[PDB]
Amino acid sequence: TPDGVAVWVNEDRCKGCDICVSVCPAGVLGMGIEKERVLGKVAKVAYPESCIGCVQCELHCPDFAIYVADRKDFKFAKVSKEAQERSEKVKANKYMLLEETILEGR
Amino acid sequence: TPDGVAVWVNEDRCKGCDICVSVCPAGVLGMGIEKERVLGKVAKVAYPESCIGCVQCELHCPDFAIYVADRKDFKFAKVSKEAQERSEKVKANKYMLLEETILEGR
Amino acid sequence: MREIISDGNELVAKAAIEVGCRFFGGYPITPSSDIMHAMSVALPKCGGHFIQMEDEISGISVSLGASMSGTKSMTASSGPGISLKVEQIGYSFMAEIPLVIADVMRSGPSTGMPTRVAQGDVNFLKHPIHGDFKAVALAPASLEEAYTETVRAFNLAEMLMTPVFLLMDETVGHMYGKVQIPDLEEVQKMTINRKEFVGDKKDYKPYGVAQDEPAVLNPFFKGYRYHVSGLHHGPIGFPTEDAKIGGDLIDRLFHKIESKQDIINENEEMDLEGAEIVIIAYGSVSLAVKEALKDYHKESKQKVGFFRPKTLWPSPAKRLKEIGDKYEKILVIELNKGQYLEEIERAMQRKVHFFGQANGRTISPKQIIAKLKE
Amino acid sequence: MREIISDGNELVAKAAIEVGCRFFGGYPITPSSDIMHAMSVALPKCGGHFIQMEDEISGISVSLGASMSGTKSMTASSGPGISLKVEQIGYSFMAEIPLVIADVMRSGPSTGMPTRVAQGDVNFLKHPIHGDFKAVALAPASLEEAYTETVRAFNLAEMLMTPVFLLMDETVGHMYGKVQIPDLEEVQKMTINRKEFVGDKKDYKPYGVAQDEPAVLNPFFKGYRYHVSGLHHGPIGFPTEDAKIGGDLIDRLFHKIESKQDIINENEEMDLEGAEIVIIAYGSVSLAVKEALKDYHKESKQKVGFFRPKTLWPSPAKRLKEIGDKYEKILVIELNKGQYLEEIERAMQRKVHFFGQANGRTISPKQIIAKLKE
Amino acid sequence: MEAQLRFTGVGGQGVLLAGEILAEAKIVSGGYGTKTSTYTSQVRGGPTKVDILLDKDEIIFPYAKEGEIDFMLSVAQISYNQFKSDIKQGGIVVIDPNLVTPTKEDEEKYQIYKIPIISIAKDEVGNIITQSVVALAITVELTKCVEENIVLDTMLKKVPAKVADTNKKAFEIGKKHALEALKV
Amino acid sequence: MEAQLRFTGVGGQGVLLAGEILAEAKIVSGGYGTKTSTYTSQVRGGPTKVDILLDKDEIIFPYAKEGEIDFMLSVAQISYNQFKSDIKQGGIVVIDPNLVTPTKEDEEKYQIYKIPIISIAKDEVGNIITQSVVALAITVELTKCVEENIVLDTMLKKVPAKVADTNKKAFEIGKKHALEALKV
Amino acid sequence: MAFNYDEYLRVDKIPTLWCWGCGDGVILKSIIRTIDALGWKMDDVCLVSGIGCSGRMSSYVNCNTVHTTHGRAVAYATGIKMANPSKHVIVVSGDGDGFAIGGNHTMHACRRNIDLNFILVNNFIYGLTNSQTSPTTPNGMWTVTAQWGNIDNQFDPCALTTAAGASFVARESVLDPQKLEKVLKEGFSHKGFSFFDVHSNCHINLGRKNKMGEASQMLKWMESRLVSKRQFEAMSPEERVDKFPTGVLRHDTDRKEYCEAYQEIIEKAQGKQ
Amino acid sequence: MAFNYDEYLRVDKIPTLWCWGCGDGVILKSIIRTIDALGWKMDDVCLVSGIGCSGRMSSYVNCNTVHTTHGRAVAYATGIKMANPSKHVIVVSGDGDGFAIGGNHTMHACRRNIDLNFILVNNFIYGLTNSQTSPTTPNGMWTVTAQWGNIDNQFDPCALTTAAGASFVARESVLDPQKLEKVLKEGFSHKGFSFFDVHSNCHINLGRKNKMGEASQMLKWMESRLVSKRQFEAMSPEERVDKFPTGVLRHDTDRKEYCEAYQEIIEKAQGKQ
Numbered sequence A, B: 001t002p003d004g005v006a007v008w009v010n011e012d013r014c015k016g017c018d019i020c021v022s023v024c025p026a027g028v029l030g031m032g033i034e035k036e037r038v039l040g041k042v043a044k045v046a047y048p049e050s051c052i053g054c055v056q057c058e059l060h061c062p063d064f065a066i067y068v069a070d071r072k073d074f075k076f077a078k079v080s081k082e083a084q085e086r087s088e089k090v091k092a093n094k095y096m097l098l099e100e101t102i103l104e105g106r
Numbered sequence C, D: 001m002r003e004i005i006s007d008g009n010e011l012v013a014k015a016a017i018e019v020g021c022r023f024f025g026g027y028p029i030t031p032s033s034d035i036m037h038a039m040s041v042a043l044p045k046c047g048g049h050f051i052q053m054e055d056e057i058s059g060i061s062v063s064l065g066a067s068m069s070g071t072k073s074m075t076a077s078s079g080p081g082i083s084l085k086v087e088q089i090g091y092s093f094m095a096e097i098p099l100v101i102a103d104v105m106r107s108g109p110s111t112g113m114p115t116r117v118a119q120g121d122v123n124f125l126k127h128p129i130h131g132d133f134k135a136v137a138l139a140p141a142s143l144e145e146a147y148t149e150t151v152r153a154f155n156l157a158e159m160l161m162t163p164v165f166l167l168m169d170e171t172v173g174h175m176y177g178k179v180q181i182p183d184l185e186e187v188q189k190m191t192i193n194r195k196e197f198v199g200d201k202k203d204y205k206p207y208g209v210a211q212d213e214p215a216v217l218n219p220f221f222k223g224y225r226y227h228v229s230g231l232h233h234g235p236i237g238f239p240t241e242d243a244k245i246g247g248d249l250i251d252r253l254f255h256k257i258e259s260k261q262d263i264i265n266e267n268e269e270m271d272l273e274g275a276e277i278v279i280i281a282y283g284s285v286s287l288a289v290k291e292a293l294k295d296y297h298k299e300s301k302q303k304v305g306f307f308r309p310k311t312l313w314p315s316p317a318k319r320l321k322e323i324g325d326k327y328e329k330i331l332v333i334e335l336n337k338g339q340y341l342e343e344i345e346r347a348m349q350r351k352v353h354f355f356g357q358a359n360g361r362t363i364s365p366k367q368i369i370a371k372l373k374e
Numbered sequence E, F: 001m002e003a004q005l006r007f008t009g010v011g012g013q014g015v016l017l018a019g020e021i022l023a024e025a026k027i028v029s030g031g032y033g034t035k036t037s038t039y040t041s042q043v044r045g046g047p048t049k050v051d052i053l054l055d056k057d058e059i060i061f062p063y064a065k066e067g068e069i070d071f072m073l074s075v076a077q078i079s080y081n082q083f084k085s086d087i088k089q090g091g092i093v094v095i096d097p098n099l100v101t102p103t104k105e106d107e108e109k110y111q112i113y114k115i116p117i118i119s120i121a122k123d124e125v126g127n128i129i130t131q132s133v134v135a136l137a138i139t140v141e142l143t144k145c146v147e148e149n150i151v152l153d154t155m156l157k158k159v160p161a162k163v164a165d166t167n168k169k170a171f172e173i174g175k176k177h178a179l180e181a182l183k184v
Numbered sequence G, H: 001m002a003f004n005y006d007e008y009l010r011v012d013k014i015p016t017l018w019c020w021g022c023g024d025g026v027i028l029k030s031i032i033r034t035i036d037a038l039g040w041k042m043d044d045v046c047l048v049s050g051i052g053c054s055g056r057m058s059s060y061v062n063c064n065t066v067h068t069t070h071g072r073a074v075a076y077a078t079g080i081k082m083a084n085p086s087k088h089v090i091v092v093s094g095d096g097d098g099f100a101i102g103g104n105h106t107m108h109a110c111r112r113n114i115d116l117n118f119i120l121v122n123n124f125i126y127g128l129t130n131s132q133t134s135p136t137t138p139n140g141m142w143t144v145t146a147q148w149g150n151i152d153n154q155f156d157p158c159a160l161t162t163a164a165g166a167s168f169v170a171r172e173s174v175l176d177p178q179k180l181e182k183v184l185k186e187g188f189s190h191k192g193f194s195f196f197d198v199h200s201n202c203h204i205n206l207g208r209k210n211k212m213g214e215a216s217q218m219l220k221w222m223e224s225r226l227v228s229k230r231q232f233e234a235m236s237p238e239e240r241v242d243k244f245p246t247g248v249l250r251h252d253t254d255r256k257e258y259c260e261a262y263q264e265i266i267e268k269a270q271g272k273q
């Protein structure tokens, strides 16, 4: 559990099953193209600030690759309608992170 | 189908399972001792003139040993309470013919 | 003749269809699922019935039931699945119900390596059932043989009224290439159908045949009413426990197969004149051997022969004894721990050199050349 | 040395209970049902578990599961039931799970004559499973041996960690008489239990043994966690497909059985000095032979010897070869069409006389004397 | 050897049970005895038989030898038809006339006796289940292979106690009838 | 013999599907060809290989020989690290830089080429499934063992037509990239 | 059908062979009468039975008879029917058969709805092998493998088959042969898998050790156990202990037979494509 | 249990190996979390699983793991459990396993009520052997052995287990692991045969040929086909097509354990009589 981060993934295991990004209420993850590996698409966290205590992602990873920091040693943000709008917009793009998200490498 | 015989038993196919006597409303059948056979008892028709078209007995014999006449060629008797009394007092006698029936060997 | 480009399993299915098979049933299992997949599409083309049950016991029982009424049927399995059919095979041996069972070998024992090649089902199929048994087992060893051997197996099963095994191999099944097969007219004309007592009186004697021929069984629902069972039966089929009839039944069951030997087993002998060492082998192993003798013959001070039996059981002991007596150097090559070695050594009353490999890999005919140096 | 009046099945059950078996599971079938009846009443005596399953596959699977965790178990069946267990038996051979399987032989093939006696399950159990398999099988031939042979089978199964068959016979099973058996102290002293790894850390090496010793398996729920399977396994037990390990595992499995040959098989040899003929035989048929040899002393110029093996598999080929080389006339007596005669003929590199009978009856040793006249 | 006996009947009569009691009586007396039973796949009504071999020395072959069997007791015609040819010339045969009728050749060849065992069991004793105790009582009185007291004790310690006494009485009756069969 | 080819990859990719096409084309052209596929019990993500033998006479052994495989094409590291020992010294090896990173010893041993087949198939043509058609599109100029017309006809009579047109385009594209691979 | 039972019987085999009063001859008579009443011709009737105490029924009917191995009768019947999908085939088996060892076969036959006529003779034990414990033996009874009282629970063949997906499920007994014959007549004319659970009696092996050694005592015991469907449906949940409803329990009239759909597969699949 | 999944696992086998995203790791995580929640010590749990596509679960957990043959997992588990009637045993198998070939074993284990923890991983087809037809495969789909539409009907594992006599029947899915873990927690503490029907997804062999090639499409299809128990009970009989209730379905309380009864048999059998 790194200090200062809420949700982080392991790039050496994640395969790109499009399951973890399909359950996030806030839509803070996106499947970016990575041609170094076989499948070619890997999950990258884009908005760690908007992470909610919904452990669902780790509950929906059949690969043991994504982890979320605990409630005791970390503080999670609040629920906002902008988070839901962003989640639905990212979901409606075939689970690929939208281009403008790369405005700061998110 | 002999003449004037409402019901007759084949002595070479009977075994003595007591089922045939136990389902006779008119109290017509009775079991007689026969030391010449393995089970020692054989079914006998005692009062053929009181027979009723209740073919149930032939429906309950498992060894094809008892036969009843046919309605089209034979006229069957009627229902009387004396026959039912005889049937009850026969069932009370371990499905065997009572001693009084030995008045004429019927 | 006709030339096609295909693989072993589709060739086996095609030969089965051409010979006249119209019923198939089994439980799919790797690597023998290809035959089932081909048959499932091939059979509805000609109006046949393909049914898949929950396990192998039902898969062979439905085939036995369909072929009991006068229909051509076959079943296929691989390894462990065959171990689940041995209960019914004996039944088919006792009631004289024809059947053809294809067995695509893999790496035995139990699952182990389910994607390798092995020849461990020889001594197993020599005597798989309890009691007495006379096994008939073929052995395709080439792409061109998966068709003719299948036709011969069907003809033998119909002629002898006994279960017949087809010892296909993973290497032969999965290989791909160009094959040449006989034409339609001759294949159809060579077909042998089971004999039926037409007569005028009723059958009255389905099992009352001579001491050296199989029983005649008319199809069901045709007027002749007889009883079939797995017990020791009499002339009609009713079970009996008499000593004379019980002994005569098994005696006839053995004699009906051991007396037609001249038509049952074929074997290919090459370079047997003047040879010093024989490389007697069977099955897909020959696919390596035939190549090695092509390279060893380029430079050599001796000639090397080859004797490949195309029919494993019953064994051709009469020819094996003469071959062993004639020559001095023998070498048996197999893909197991010497299971067919036992029969070769029992014949010729002699001891021979052995070369085996039971790690799931092939022979790599360079090994044949290395071993021939001794 | 206590003596009791009983029959074969009661003696087998008593020996199994006194050795320390504490689990049973099977399916009822004539004539191997008396063992189940005795066990169902004798197992609650000592706190054991008896359970009758829905078939024979489950009957052997529950026994394998019980004996996998460290409990001495056994199973019993006859004829067709054994034909249903051959799937799991190979698993018990590959995972090295001890088990004792009693088989009361009856008249094969399939159902046939359920109330008769035959010896048709010899070649079947020589190699019952697919793939490679090394068989250990005993053969009781007397009422006094139904106890000691069961004790020896349990000891061998515990020492080698391999399934052991007990080829009991219907004649031996149903004969009723007075027998002598060893005292309880001697039986409890000679009992052999499986090895345990008391050492620290964890087992971690259940299959990491030398090339001539079996595996060391500790009871479940004790701290040592290991994974068991039927696939080709490495030192720990996880499946593997490497050529070296795969080829070494089967070699070790064969060598662990073919190296204890000095203590695995016994045989009884009588009148083998100055004998002109031998009447080599096995099983209940010997009960006739020993009678006939008692009457052929009346005027015979020639002397007849007798060599009866006590463990059918693996065969005593080393002694058989010398017996064949030393003596001129060999006679084989059996209750089938000669399926164990093949092994005797493979040994001795020779052809020998035979006298078989597969009609479901005994030998009536007058026939033995009539055959000895020749 | 000493004795070869054969008890035949119909499956479900219980006469055959009187056999192994004699075997155990001989075993306790200081000898050797063996029993072999031939049955059928039929639960009731089928022919059943038991052969018994009694010897002073070890018994090797369990089965009996055809053409030598000494004593035979039959209470059924179906079995007696099949299991009769094995009797040696001038043997002892016991039958009940109500259920078995022998041919003239059998009467000329054997020493047949007619005792209604089942009728004695049902009408004289009272319980038909004890018929075996009657049949055994005949055998000891005709073959005399085992002493009486050993047989009585072995029979007594092999039956439920609730009927023990009447069982003993049954034995007595059998002996009486056997002594009435020696009119010759 | 003429051609010994080894195509290696990860199960579920599709490159290995272009194996039997070359063998069929060679067989139709008058020669003989044999294909053997080595697959693992793993359905997806497992190393898979295809060995192809092409010659002018009858092929007896369907399996190849170590140290005699003329050509290798790998698009995965797992199978490359395993099945690289059978390549003859100074052989032809093809890989892709996005999925395979070879060692300097293999560079000295071989004449390895670097062509990103998967990227070309997915990005340029638009459909990634056609990658196999691209891969063999290079092999035609790699071993030069068969003319292009026969291969084109075999492709035409082995794919549904609904995409065959664009499939043909992919083939052409591969050819051009092949002509861009021979920088020497 | 009537006094003339010898037309559908092998008179040479008669008399039967069961014990002296086993409730199996009644079922044979009912089968014969039902076969004749529907107008079936004996040349088009095949009777396949498993091995057991009730398998002897396949050695008496004068038709094409098959005696299979233990628990495999349903598979042989399926093969025979699929080979000749225009004739009538009747399966007869016990409780130690396909509801004990062949449970998978019976369940799958119910699932795929093959046009069979399964008839299960229920005697609650393994009669042939001298009174073992059946999957339908009630707890507390004395068997040979449970000498202190059976503890294994009971099956519900009608409920089990209904859950499997059988199209016609009915239960009767040898107590009233007329109702049994009527229900057999109704079930045979159906066009799907028909299951008949017939409660027979085994007084020799089951009732001998349970104080029911006579046929009449066991028959009246089963009479007490059995109630009609309406009365059972009108009882309280606490009143339905060891109570079985008789009559036809399910007669679904909308099911596609397996052969009827495989014919469509043949027609639309490779019928010139 | 939590973010630390490596305490209960073997480090040398991770990562998983199934396809890339098969719904099998979720079941493993749920089992680990539930087994840790109860406070069970791993030195007492035996995990037995058969061959197939879901057997790999036996090769990852760090406990006494058993790999059995096809369809015999329940029998081996029964043997182990009665061998040591004081420890917890969990069985994991697929649809082609003991609900396809070993159906008799599952039905009889339900009948005799032995303390097992049978868990069925349902993916509707044969995942390992390249998409054959399963008894739970809906009709009209594409399989390698039925290229024109499946005709065999559907088994109902929950209904069949209820008919057999199971003491605890519950159904869940991988679409929501929290409720699955809660159901597992409720069912593991029971003292009878517990049946857990879990809906998994196989997009590589089912969805590729049925226009459902992506994991999301298959997951949303399964979500659409699944409704809660109360909601399902609130629908009309016609509307209840292709619907399955979710949650604990039967939790009958007063039943006698098989081992608890054999203990009394042992005590009163020969314990000095």
Ligand SMILES: Cc1ncc(C[n+]2csc(CCOP(=O)(O)OP(=O)(O)O)c2C)c(N)n1
Pocket: D028, D029, D030, D080, D110, D111, D112, D114, G051, G052, G053, G054, G055, G070, G093, G094, G095, G096, G097, G123, G125, G126, G127, G128, G129, G134
């Ligand atoms: C060839 C053969 N296989 C198996 C058996 C075992 N067997 C045959 S019938 C039977 C009892 C089954 O009884 P069930 O079918 O339930 O009804 P029943 O015949 O007692 O009326 C058994 C154990 C046998 N006797 N013969």
Ligand SMILES: Cc1ncc(C[n+]2csc(CCOP(=O)(O)OP(=O)(O)O)c2C)c(N)n1
Pocket: C028, C029, C030, C080, C111, C114, H051, H052, H053, H054, H070, H093, H094, H095, H096, H097, H100, H123, H125, H126, H127, H128, H129, H134
């Ligand atoms: C010994 C053995 N048995 C069976 C198979 C093939 N096989 C694997 S799964 C299966 C059907 C059962 O699979 P199922 O449990 O129904 O679903 P899955 O999770 O595998 O997709 C078969 C026949 C095999 N390769 N080896």
Ligand code: SF4
Pocket: A009, A013, A014, A015, A016, A017, A018, A019, A020, A021, A043, A060, A061, A062, A063, A064, A065, A066, H021
């Ligand atoms: S669920 Fe896990 S494996 Fe799947 S994409 Fe997300 S992080 Fe990767």
Ligand code: SF4
Pocket: A007, A023, A024, A025, A026, A027, A028, A029, A050, A051, A052, A053, A054, A055, A056, A057, A058, A068
């Ligand atoms: S924990 Fe919740 S908010 Fe954070 S990434 Fe996962 S689903 Fe989104």
Ligand code: SF4
Pocket: B007, B023, B024, B025, B026, B027, B028, B029, B050, B051, B052, B053, B054, B055, B056, B057, B058, B068
């Ligand atoms: S027909 Fe009726 S009255 Fe006549 S004997 Fe039969 S049961 Fe009695």
Ligand code: SF4
Pocket: B009, B013, B014, B015, B016, B017, B018, B019, B020, B021, B042, B043, B060, B061, B062, B063, B064, B065, B066
């Ligand atoms: S029912 Fe038939 S067999 Fe039974 S006693 Fe009456 S007549 Fe005889």
Ligand code: SF4
Pocket: E043, E044, G017, G018, G019, G021, G022, G023, G024, G053, G123, G127, G128, G201, G202, G203, G204, G205
């Ligand atoms: S044993 Fe039972 S079921 Fe068998 S015939 Fe006798 S009474 Fe009928």
Ligand code: SF4
Pocket: F043, F044, H018, H019, H022, H023, H053, H123, H127, H128, H201, H202, H203, H204, H205
């Ligand atoms: S084949 Fe199907 S069930 Fe097996 S791992 Fe792949 S997706 Fe999962």
Ligand SMILES: [Mg+2]
Pocket: H053, H094, H095, H096, H121, H122, H123, H124, H125, H126, H127
């Ligand atoms: Mg599955």
